[PDB]
Each structure stands twice: as structure tokens, then as C-alpha cells.
Amino acid sequence: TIEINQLKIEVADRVLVEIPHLLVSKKARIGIIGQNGLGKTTLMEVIAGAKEATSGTVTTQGKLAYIKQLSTDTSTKSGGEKTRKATQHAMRQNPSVLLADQPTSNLDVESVKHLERQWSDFHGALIIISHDRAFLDALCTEIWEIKNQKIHVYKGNYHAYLEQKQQQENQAELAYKEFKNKKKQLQASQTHHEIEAGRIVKPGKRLNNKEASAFKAGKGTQQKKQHSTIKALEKRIERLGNVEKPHTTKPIKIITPDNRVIKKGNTILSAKETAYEIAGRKLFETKAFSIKAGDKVALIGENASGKTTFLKEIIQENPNLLCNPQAKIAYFDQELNGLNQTKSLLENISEISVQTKQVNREVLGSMHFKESDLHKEVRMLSGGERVKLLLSMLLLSDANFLILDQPTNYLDIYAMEALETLIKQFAGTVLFVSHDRTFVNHVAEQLLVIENNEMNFHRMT
Amino acid sequence: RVNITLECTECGDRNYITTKNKRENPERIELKKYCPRLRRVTLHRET
RNA sequence: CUGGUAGUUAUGGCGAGAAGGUCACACCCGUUCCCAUCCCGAACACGGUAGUUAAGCUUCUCUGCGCCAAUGGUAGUUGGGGGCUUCCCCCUGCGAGAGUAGGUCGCUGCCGGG
RNA sequence: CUGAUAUGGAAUGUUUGUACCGCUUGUACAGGAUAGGUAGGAGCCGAAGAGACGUGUGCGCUAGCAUACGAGGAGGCAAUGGUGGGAUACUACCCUGGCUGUAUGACCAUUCUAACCCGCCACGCUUAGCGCGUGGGGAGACAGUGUCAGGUGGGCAGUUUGACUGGGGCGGUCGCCUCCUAAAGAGUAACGGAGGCGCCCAAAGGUUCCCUCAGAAUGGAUGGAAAUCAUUCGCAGAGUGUAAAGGCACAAGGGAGCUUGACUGCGAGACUGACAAGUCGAGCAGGGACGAAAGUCGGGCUUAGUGAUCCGGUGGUUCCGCAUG
RNA sequence: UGCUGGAAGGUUAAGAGGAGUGCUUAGCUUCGGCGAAGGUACGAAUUGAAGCCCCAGUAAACGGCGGCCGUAACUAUAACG
RNA sequence: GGUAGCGGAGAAAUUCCAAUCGAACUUGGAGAUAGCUGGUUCUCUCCGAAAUAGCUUUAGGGCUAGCCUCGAGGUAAAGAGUCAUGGAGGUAGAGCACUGUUUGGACUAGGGGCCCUUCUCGGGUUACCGAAUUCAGAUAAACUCCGAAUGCCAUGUACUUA
RNA sequence: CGGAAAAAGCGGAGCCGUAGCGAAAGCGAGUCUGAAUAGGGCGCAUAAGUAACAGGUCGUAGACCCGAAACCAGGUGAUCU
RNA sequence: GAUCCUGAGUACGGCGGAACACGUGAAAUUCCGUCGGAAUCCGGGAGGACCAUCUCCCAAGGCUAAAUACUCCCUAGUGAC
RNA sequence: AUAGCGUGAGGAAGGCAGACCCAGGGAACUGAAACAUCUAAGUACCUGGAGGAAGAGAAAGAAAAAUCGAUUUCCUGAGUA
RNA sequence: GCGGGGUGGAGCAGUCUGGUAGCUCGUCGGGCUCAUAACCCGAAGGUCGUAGGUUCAAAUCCUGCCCCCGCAAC
């Protein structure tokens, strides 16, 4: 169906993807994975024809429907509603091959279940990007890792991928172990023959001057033979090869400046019981509550539940929701409006940082942005890097009260673990949303729950 | 830092080769250079 | 005489001191127009002459610094020849640098006003 | 060792595949609620058996849907409205799968036997433990043989395994730039003394205009030995993308604007020089940039930043094109 | 590392397959060019063994059989950690 | 009597296979190839080198150039030597005007101590040192404000000479 | 062919030179490059070759003479061991 | 000239090799081994891949002197041996 | 019945000229200033067949605006393509 | 001279890939116990040998020195 050949995808100075040959089949079911910043979405756009490659070709067959990573449809609907709209639109188009970039970003459990069932029953080609491991297990039968600027192909589910990957890991460690050992072994023998060679020409005490002088030349030749053994060992070391140490990918963790340390137990937000509505239609009834300082408050709900609406009410300062003074709110949106798409990111973050330049750069380093990235447009960034930008900007702002609608969207496992660490260690206060049960279990000290049009509060997990 | 052919827009004929730093100049360069086929100055962009 | 403009290796300069002038050169006055300054009518640019020779500028004085500067000798040296050969001596020719006697506040030329 | 194929054929059967007939399948969200699509569509089904009730089975998103069975016997649903991307009845053509049935077509397995094989027996040629023939028995489409292909392969083979060098060897070096040596033109060796290169710059180029540094003395709020500021002194004690030498302040050092001459064809003549190559080049033409103009501009203050042919690749072309096109 | 055994998957040939693409031209076109059949050059999917990757085992198989700190009523050393 | 050399036999040593064995003897390809050594035969006459550059799987080889010879050419006679004149050039020497190395003296930021004290803050300060700054004097292949002799480039009609 | 192992005669097929330039098409005392009529390269201007002999040298052949250890092919040898 | 015949497991093609000056090269032509496998007169081959057109020619069967090569020999003879 | 056995009629067997040619099989030394493709070379050598010659040979040819008419050998083409 | 290393008290990572101070044992404190150990609860302790560089920032990249363990030399 789809043929890919000699494909070079180069972004600026770096080479993003390099592919000798690939081919996709009818009835295929593919995952395509990799850390943030590696070129999944760019490759996808290049297949779809949204983007051109510096080299090589793609050759398609039939209709292809391309769901995008980032919703541009600024509109009056929920994030999940927008995501499912785009998805069902792509499927309504009746495609042969179906392209998809992180479709489970803003979805919940029921929507993910219905999606994975519908795409099981789907018959035809499809390519998926997602970090949902269970979703990939449910769906895909081939898996393409964009690692080290190349595509490493794997079969079976993500389960079997992890299996074959662990085999490769162990296999490489074994190889490097052997290689280092042989090198120590032969280079030791090389030192041994150096010692011998140095001794070949120093006569014993037992010898005489005149007697020793007679075999100087033959001992010189013994010495020569030793040196020849040495050079032979060096050749064998060359023939071992330049076996490379295996790559230990560096962890992520966020480094936060000590903004303000107001007392654990201080009431940060008092919210009285109130029924809410945005177009007149009722969303839910708040039963009253308070939120104290140091609280890691989760906020839970289905799609279109009232969550983002409630956060907007907070930051707009409804008098029914009194955040105390000295609170220093800092907001992150589902649809990333908090960035200026005009500015470079050093601008976007050095304008909003109350903090030192060194500290600004430390936090960017903790998000693992390279020196190459600082002058990139916000238009120019991964779905994950934009999230990291807003969160890094949020941490530079002097805030004592973070508030985060779905930061788990376009993050990998390393960054989700680092964010978990952040929220779990954070000195101030935080109110987050996420449809990841894993993240919310790992992080939630307290819970705000929306169910059957009833909001509630629980100091549980 | 990479070598770059420059093709003409009216011809598509690769009249020049030069260089650029591929980070500080990430885009296809455009420069006005003489095209000997046409015997006039013409805009050439990178390939 | 003075305002420009040149050439000449600073003997031509640096410094100090003195006299003179809206005839010019200026300083100065103003920003109304051109045009201007990472700001600023300081500069540039424009429009004017109320005050002044204080300074720039012209002229003059000097040897403090600087620069130039021989003569004689010494060094080194081409060639030749001697030895005692880390090196050195002699014959002929050339010949310093340093330092000194001494020189220097410019010297020639063109155009215009007066 | 392994596979394909010929010698080399007859069945049966599993498991997949392909096409066809049938029968069930179709739930994001919102929405009466299980909405596949396209179109028709306002009426449509049905006492020759409707809705609804009771039971089981199957599916499944576990909401309910379909399917048959007992009684019963005519009633139901849609249109309409709203929901929504889209409408509900029913009709047909589709699509997506799932099952039955057929028909084809692969892989693999089991069996058979007539090819092939038997270093099994009996007989015969025949006084023969060879061979061949005949009859049985046994293996049997395997083996073996040929052709092709992958793997293993020091069992065997043909060869390679640097030069300088105070002997060879180790160590170091091998090409390019800069100083000293190098004896005041040039050149000039050593396993002689010191360092650098295998780049960078879309402005660190071109032009036009503008100005001038280091460091010290003080005076000063954070601010200090030393940030920035004012005055004075100051031929360069700075800077010159990068090593050093030469050179540069009437810029080649710093800013700003406009730009792309970091152009095409070439080039009298010189330098250097074994050859290969390297270097400088006024000027002519074309068409431009800057500047009023003069005029400057064929990269960067200069000198390193690189590698032959052969073979391949890309683009282009009023070239050829093995009788003619 | 070899040897043995396994049998799910990955990689893996020749051969089988032959989607398609160029060249050609009977006609169609105006020049440019478009072009059925056939022939021709090249050929993708799919299929495709052993071996290798992989898992167990195996040393009278090839082979291999370590460091640092402290510690006793004290002087040393360390049964011990 | 059998085993015969890409082989055989080996109580195994590179042992033996007709006085030959890390691969027999013989014949042929075969006049192997040899950048290696040796040798290369009569006479006189004229001229007469080099042992250098550069490149080289190159270093005791080769190739081109430089150097020799023979022949023929061509002239705005170009060669060589000296004299005169004009020039590039930074050596010897000398010098310190920069850069380094350095001696003595003046003088000091600052460090160490005795301390007075004391929130050791600031002083008495010490020749116990001491960055630097400055005066005089030394030194230099990779230092130069200077700077020869010689040698080099040329010009000339000078004066000889080939 | 002719003929004495001759000499003539015959034999003009072919070879060299007379025109070069260009990768070639091709143009031609010009040609190639190039936009050029420019300049420059090569040529012509600036005209002597050819056949045979002899001398020098070079190449292919053993190529100056002698000389390896070794390699390959066909055979002979177990009367020694 | 109704009809019929005109060299079949070849001619070609794939794979593997070789010979043609031609080393798989764009590789025509010829031959060997193995797989496949034609038309046969409105037919078939070649003209250096290949296609069309044109031209030339009839394979897969056989025979064939002379001119050419050599000299253990015979006869007569020659030599700036 | 064939095999087999026997008899009779023919035929061959082997040698050389250390030459010339046809086929089967087929080196290395050497050269490339190493060397492996390549060369040496289809040479030397083995073997088989022969004959006085052999082999080849009467176009499924060579060629191209023009045709020629079986093979072989020599001169040229040409050290060209 | 050649290799390893020098990170709380001990042993070890982390360095190659600059922002991340970690594992085990131990120490201090409070509990349990008649008391010690074990166990349970908390906490401290490293400017990464050192002096300088590069960088916005260094355990980490560059340089010099000083130490320890081996191996050589002697």
C-alpha cells in the first residue's frame, strides 16, 4: 500500500529520521513510538503530504485520513468533544489507511474503550502514535521505534516490543562486557611483553661484561619478537571492533525555585455550594468545601463534565470561589493558549519569568530543552515541548498555586514520571486534571469528584 | 555548515554552489545572482 | 598681510610664554526649514552677527622633551696571511650603533579677498 | 547440512487463502435510544399471523438487539418536532466483519504403488560370495544422481602482513600553514627548537557614510583591585573570527544604512616550478550592487582549512546514437 | 566459546509470483504531446529451508577460578563484620 | 610382496620414503625470475660530470630536472669580471625604544606573626615576606629605536674578456 | 604475376605528406570556447615531404653474459628405510 | 498453383559457465550443463540490448579438391654456414 | 521367446617423424615493478582420433540510398575500432 | 614512567550524555526492653582531592599540581 524509500527527514541542522526502505500493508496495525522531539509527527505529516521530505519518497494508495496531534479548532466545545469530532470525521471520510497522532490525549476511559473497539473492528490500514501502552497492546501488530535517527521495527504488541527490546539491551551489555574484558586481557599481555622486552636487554648479575656483550644482538631480536607480538595484539584489538557502550538515557526531573513557603494548613480556596451553568444548561452542583496549602488536589470527571469551566471560574474570581490573597495562581490550559505563538521560547519564558536568567535556564535544562531550541517558534514545537514550555513558564512565575488542566497529554513516560515527582514534591499547592488513573493514583493526596451533576471533595486517594 | 546548490526559478538550472550554516540559516537561501542562459540577474533559491 | 589648498623624512613636532583681529577664520546666538543624534541642535545641518580675542587661528620667543647631526676613534667585516685555536693576531679596503661638538620652533609653491 | 527443480505418480485429510449463494453484524458524543453508508421515500408492514406478554439461545459497548417456541389475534412504527455531521418506518445497491454451503486453488501430514533403490532370499546363466535376468519379500515418490541456491568451512589452497630511522626494533613521525635555525635577495638539512590546521562567518563579505583603542590619574551611591559615567594623559602599550610572522589608526580596527561582486565568460603578462599543480593579475565584454560622483566590488588584513585518476550518482545540453526512425 | 536438544517468533537465498514502470508504435493530435495490442528491458507485494538471533543443558568439553575498609584489654595479626 | 610424493608409513622425532626430505628423484614449461653480486675482450684524438632537488610500498631502485657530450640554429650579443650609479634586504655588531630574562636601590597593594584590642571592626605596627609602580645598570636564536661589510637584483655607452 | 633460389616489366590496393580545429555534430585557413564581432588555446601565416640505406637509441621478443632458493606438469622409485 | 511438404524436445528463454579482440559490461553472435519451451510460409532468422520499418537470408542434416602447415625419408643441388 | 553358448565371413588391436591439426582435459613460474580480477595461456603437458594434409566450406552470410555472391591462405585495414 | 582511581565515616555508583547528589552498612536522637543488640520512628553528615579555566550554570568538559593502589625502573 504505502511505500517509503530513501527517506531523509532533516529538521534544521539535525537529521530527524533516516530510512532506507519501509512498506506498509493492507490490514496493517502499527504503532510508531519514541520520546518527545524525535520526529514521529513530522514523519506522519510527510506520509500524509502535509510536509515534504528533503529526500526519498512516499507512495500512497487510496484515501488517507489524518488526525492531527494539536487541535486548531478553537471553538465552544470540550477538549474531548473536539478530539472525538476530528476522529469520527476522519473515519466518516472512509479511508484506506488511517493516520493518527496521539488520539487518546484528552479522552477518558469510556471514550478510549469505544475508540479501541471501533478501531479493532476497523478493517484496513492504520498508523497510530500514542503513549497509552494498553491502547497499543489492544491495537497494533507492528511497532516502529524512532531511536538514534532510525526506525527499529518490532512485531507483535507493545508487550512483545518490550520483550525484544530487553533482549537487545541484555545482548548489548553482554557484548560490551566481553569486549572490555578481552581488551583488558590483551592489553595486559601487551604490558607483559613490554616488561619482558625491557628485561631482554638488561643482563643479569650472574653475567660478565664480555660475556653479555656477545648476545646483545640476539637479545635485540628477542626484543623485536616481543614487539611484534605486541603489534599483533593491537591488530587483534582492532579486529574486535569499536563496540559501543549501551545508551543509558538520562532521567528527567524538574528543578523548582523556592518561590514561597506559606503555611501548610492555610485555607487557599474556600468554595461555597453553588449550581453552575455556562449556556444556561446546568453542569453540576458544588457542595461547599475548602482547599488548604500543600494540598495536591485532583479533579476528576468524564468528558464535558465541568472541569475546565470550573477552573476558568477560579481564575476569573467568582465570589463563590474565594481564593485567599497571597495565593499566586498559575494556569495551564487543555489547548495551550497560555503561550504566545509569535514569540520564541526564550522570549516567551524570559518575559513571564520573575526569576533569574540562570534559574530560567536551569528549569529549561530540567525540561531537557537543548541550546538549539531556545530560538524556535512556539509554532515550531512538539506537542510535548509546548506543554513543557507552559509548565516551565508556570514554575518560573512566582506561583504558590498551580492549576493544570490535562498536562498528561503529549508527554512520554520519562516526563510523566518527572511531573509526578514534581507535583508530589511541590512545596506550594496544586490542582490538576488528568484522565490517567496511573498518574492520579501516584499523585493524588486529595480528590475533587464530579459525578451525576454532583461535585464533591474527599481527602482520600 | 553545509554545501548548497542554488537553482534558478525561471530555469531550474543549478548556476552556483556555496555554503551556509544549517542552524543559523535553516531555510532555503534566496539570492539574486546572474543566470548566463538568460544573461540577466535572477533570483536563485537553494535546492 | 590674511583665508583656503598643496608638496617636503618632525631641523617641520610636543610643551611653555607673549601680541592681535565679527577684513576673513572663529567662538558664540537660535532650531523657524532641509537634516540630524543607540539619548542630547555637542557633532552634523540649517538660519543669523548681539558679545568676545578667552580659546581655536595668525605672528613672534625658546632648546624643557623630542627630532636631526657630523669629525675623530672603537666594533664588526670582504680579500690576503699568520697562530697559541671555547678563541685570537697582523696587512689593505669598507665601516657602524652608542655618545659628543653642533642644528631645529619649519621650508618651498598656487588661488581668492584686503 | 539445507532448500527449489528434473528423474518422479495415486489417493485421502487437516489448516489457512480466494470468489460466490445464503444467513446474522453494525451503539463515540448529543439524541426518545444499539444511527454503518448512498438514494428513494410518505406512508409502510401485517388476521395466509401485528404490537405487546412468557421462556431459551446467540451477540455484546452488558444499554439492550436479533433469533425461535406457548397463548393471543391486530395492531404497530415512521412522517411531524427535537437531537445531531447525519434520522429514524420500509425499499433497494453497497461496505465492514462473523457463520453455513459450494467451487476453486496453496502448505503440511498419513496411506498406497507402478518409477528408483535393496551390501535380503529361491532359481537360472553357472564348476562364480562379481554381475545380470526371473519370482517373492522389503523400503518407496523418500533415498541417490544432476542443475541452481544459502550456510558452515585453515580440512586444503593462493597471497598480504609499510617507509624514515646515527644498525633493526619500540616510541614518534608521514599531508598543509607560521616563526627560529637560514649565515641582511631567494633557497637551504637533521628523530633540530616552538606552536597551529583538516574550520568558521549570510555577517565576521561588498559599498557609502561616521569614529578610534589599552591603561593610568582622580571625582564619584548599590559597586569592591577592577562593571558603567565625567575630565585629563595616551602612536597604539588595544583589536585584527583562529597559531605565529609581516602589516594595519590618511584603517585592514569599530558602528549604521543599502545590499549579495561569496557574479558569467575570459585574461596581455608575471611569480613559482622536475611534472602534476599552486599564486598574483591590470584590462575587455555581459548584466548588476553601493555611492550624488569619483570610483570600489570576481569573498574575508595577508599567508593553512585539503586530496589525483578510475568508477558511480544528480541536473542540464541547437553533441553522438553500429541499416533508417 | 563450542557440543547437544527445542520450536513459537525475527533475519535469511535461489526459485516460484508477476502489481506495475520505462522503450517501441497502429491510430489520436497542431507543434509540443496522448497513446490500444504485441514484443522488449527492469521488476514490487506475497511465498520461501538450514543456519544465525533466542531458550534449557553440558566442564575427565574449550576454558576460568577477585578486590577494598575495619575489627580482640592493644603489639602484632584478625576467628568476626 | 603391498602402501608413492596435493602422496604414503610413522610406540610421534619434522622421523623415514635408495648417502636427497618443513614436502624425494628425474624430465619438461625453462634461457623461470633476480631493482642482487660477479664479468663484459683492440688503439689513439677532442670534450668531460655527478654523488643534488622533488616525487615514489620509496630509501643500495627508478623517473623528471640540475650537471656532460654531439649537431644545427638565431640575433636589439643576450654570457663572465671589474668601475660607476640606483635599489631590495634586517645578519654581524650595537642598543634597550617594545617583548621576555635579570641586579641593586626607592616605595607599596596585599599575605604571616607580636599583638592593642575586639561584633578582631579599626590601629601600633613588623624591614618576615610582598604584587605591582618608579631610578640606575645588565642580557637575548625564536627582542629591536638602530645597523654595516659582503653577497644579490639591475642599469650603462664605461673597460677588458669569451 | 613473371622469371635463373635472378633483373626488369606489371601490380597504386594501401601508407605517409599536402589543413587544421573540435568530445562530436560540424566548420575550414580558420576553428573551439563563449552571447560576442572580444580575447585566448591550437593551427595557418612562417609550405617539404617521401622511399630506401647506414649510424645512434627505444620497444616487443631470453635481448648482454653467467647465476637462485623456489613453483607447476608428466612420469620413475618401498632391491635402503 | 485446390491442397500438401520443407530438418521439435530444436530454435529460443531463465540459471550457471565458456568461446567470439569483447573480463556481464547496454552485451548482440556461437557453444556446453540443467530447467522450461515456439511458429512452421499471411511462416522463421540476422543486421551488436530492444521495438517498428526496410533490406538480406532459410537454421536446427551431410559431402566436397585447389590455394595453406610440416618434413623421419628419396633424387638432384645450393650456401659472403 | 530372449539371455547365454558354439561355429563360420569380414574387421580392429600395435608402432611412429620429439614435426604439422581436430577434439577432450588443462597448470604454474612470470608480468602487473606486492597481489587476488587479469596476464603468462587455452601455451607447456596428458589423452584420444586421424590424414597426407587436417580443419573450414557452398549464406538462416557480409553489408547499406550499392550492392556483393561458398570456404581457406597472403597483403592491407591496424596496433585502428 | 604506565595504568586505575580521589564523591558524608567505610565500600560503590553517578562522569562518557553539563542543570538531577543516589544504594548498602554505619552515626546521632526518640521509642521497645530491667539494660545492650536486633526491630520501629525521625534527622544529620558530602561544595565531589586541589588551583585555575570554558559555560547562564560543572562532581560531570579542558589544563597543572598533590595524594593512594597496582605494574615497571631503581
Ligand SMILES: Nc1ncnc2c1ncn2[C@@H]1O[C@H](COP(=O)(O)OP(=O)(O)OP(=O)(O)O)[C@@H](O)[C@H]1O
Ligand atoms: N519547522 C521546524 N523548524 C525547526 N524545528 C522544527 C520544525 N518543526 C519541528 N521542529 C522540531 O523538530 C522536532 C520534531 O518534533 P515532532 O513534532 O516531529 O516530534 P514528536 O516526536 O512527534 O513529538 P511529540 O511526542 O511531542 O508529539 C522537535 O524538536 C520540533 O520542535
Ligand SMILES: Nc1ncnc2c1ncn2[C@@H]1O[C@H](COP(=O)(O)OP(=O)(O)OP(=O)(O)O)[C@@H](O)[C@H]1O
Ligand atoms: N463557552 C461555552 N459556551 C457553551 N458551551 C460551553 C462553553 N464552555 C463549555 N461548554 C460546554 O460545557 C460542557 C463542559 O465544558 P468543559 O469543556 O469545561 O468540560 P470538561 O469537563 O472540562 O471537559 P474535558 O476534560 O473533556 O475538556 C460541554 O458540553 C461544552 O460544550
Ligand SMILES: [K+]
Ligand atoms: K638416487
Ligand SMILES: [K+]
Ligand atoms: K584565435
Ligand SMILES: [K+]
Ligand atoms: K555475451
Ligand SMILES: [K+]
Ligand atoms: K544477412
Ligand SMILES: [K+]
Ligand atoms: K576434409
Ligand SMILES: [Mg+2]
Ligand atoms: Mg510530536
Ligand SMILES: [Mg+2]
Ligand atoms: Mg594457509
Ligand SMILES: [Mg+2]
Ligand atoms: Mg604467485
Ligand SMILES: [Mg+2]
Ligand atoms: Mg626499514
Ligand SMILES: [Mg+2]
Ligand atoms: Mg634569506
Ligand SMILES: [Mg+2]
Ligand atoms: Mg539506428
Ligand SMILES: [Mg+2]
Ligand atoms: Mg543449535
Ligand SMILES: [Mg+2]
Ligand atoms: Mg619441533
Ligand SMILES: [Mg+2]
Ligand atoms: Mg615460461
